[PDB]
Amino acid sequence: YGPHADSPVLMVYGLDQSKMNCDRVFNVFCLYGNVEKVKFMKSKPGAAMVEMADGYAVDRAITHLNNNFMFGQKMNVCVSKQPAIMPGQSYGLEDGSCSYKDFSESRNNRFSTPEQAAKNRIQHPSNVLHFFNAPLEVTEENFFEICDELGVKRPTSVKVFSGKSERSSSGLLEWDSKSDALETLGFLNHYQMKNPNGPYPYTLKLCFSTAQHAS
Incomplete structure (x- = not known):
């Protein structure tokens, strides 16, 4: 029940x-x-x-x-x-x-305990995705390069958030439409981004954002 x-x-x-x-x-x-x-x-x-x-x-x-x-x-x-x-x-x-x-057994599941589950916000689909766990020195150009590789639409705007005492970057990726973002989500979530400083790629994590813009 x-x-x-x-x-x-x-x-x-x-x-x-x-x-x-x-x-x-x-x-x-x-x-x-x-x-x-x-x-x-x-x-x-x-x-x-x-x-x-x-x-x-x-x-x-x-x-x-x-x-x-x-x-x-x-x-x-x-x-x-x-x-x-x-x-x-x-x-x-x-x-x-x-x-x-x-x-x-995926380590990419996000609800494996109630406290992990609680960190997932309401996920109403939007045209802006929040990204987490990208490389520290990620650039908009990096994302353009990967979208090109995947054959998905480049975001129209990328914002990387400020961070300190943080071992990965996060930010926002914006598209023109909701379907653009959803289409991209299915291709780009968990993309293995290059790690210049260690053996394991950064597993890019995406979700929906409530932010109106990647600005």
Whole structure:
């Protein structure tokens, strides 16, 4: 009892399967809860199930993402009739990745304890993304370079926040439209940014901002 959704599994239609894979779905839905599994459906092109940690995550994802547009398609986000995603009958996507993926052990999940969960603000989709965990000396040009690599739209404005006694940078990335930002989110979240000072790339973390501008 508690959440409205009677399953931790949502169904999402309206995905662009020429662009989306399980990682890119996780890149969107991880803003709303822990993502345990994603499975693209054999029966239904452009649709995927997404198992969250619980129903409250489903309620948030539906509330914020239903009827949003991505790649000109209208997304439909609703509770699944299924209580869990089972692995059976998986297939390879065109990019060679599996139609099913388990993300339950991902270090990129953001709701793994209540106190971690609490640090996620309400995530109403907007045209500005907040970025965290970028390299200390990141520049707008760095982001342009990565967006070009990924084949996504460059942000129209980038703001890096001031920081001290901080081992990574954060800031704001703005696009002209909400769909521009959402489209980018799915491609750019968790991008592995170069670390000149240590072995591990910086995992770029994005979420939605309430800021009107990256100014």
